[PDB]
């Protein structure tokens, strides 16, 4: 896949209620509150069950257990793609590269980390 420009430090992110915040300052509650505020999107916990790094040049394959039922979902992303872990924030495969490329402090995504994902409601 590819990488969008909104993970870049200083990127203005508009929360559900209209409030503006820099992407580096986003917290778990900002997402939780935004899902509540929204009339169509809700938050779904996605737990990382396995990370199969170096699938191909610059890509990792992550296997999640999405939502209540825990449906096995595997996805393919550029190593520097950051997920937002509940109570932890931006987390990727290569924190170092995500930080260098995005100037975003970042954790090491790990088996067991519950990520924030979305589904219609």
């Amino acid at each position: 896949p590819t990488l969008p420009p909104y993970f870049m430090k200083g990127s203005m992110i508009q929360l559900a209620n209209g409030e503006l915040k820099k992407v580096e300052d986003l917290k778990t509650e900002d997402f939780i509150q935004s899902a509540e505020m929204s009339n169509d999107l809700k938050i779904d916990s996605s737990t990382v069950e396995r990370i199969e790094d170096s699938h191909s040049p610059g890509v990792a394959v992550i296997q999640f257990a999405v939502g209540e039922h825990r449906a096995q979902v595997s996805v393919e992303v550029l190593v520097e793609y950051p997920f937002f872990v509940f109570g932890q924030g931006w987390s990727s495969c290569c924190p170092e590269r995500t930080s260098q490329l995005f100037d975003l402090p970042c954790s090491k995504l790990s088996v067991g980390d519950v990520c924030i994902s979305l589904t219609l409601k």
Partner: peptide, 15 residues
């Protein structure tokens, strides 16, 4: 005045 802004729902995947 106006500025380019990204919505919060772009930062999180639809797994």
């Amino acid at each position: 005045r106006s500025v380019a802004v990204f919505p919060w729902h772009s930062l999180v995947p639809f797994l």
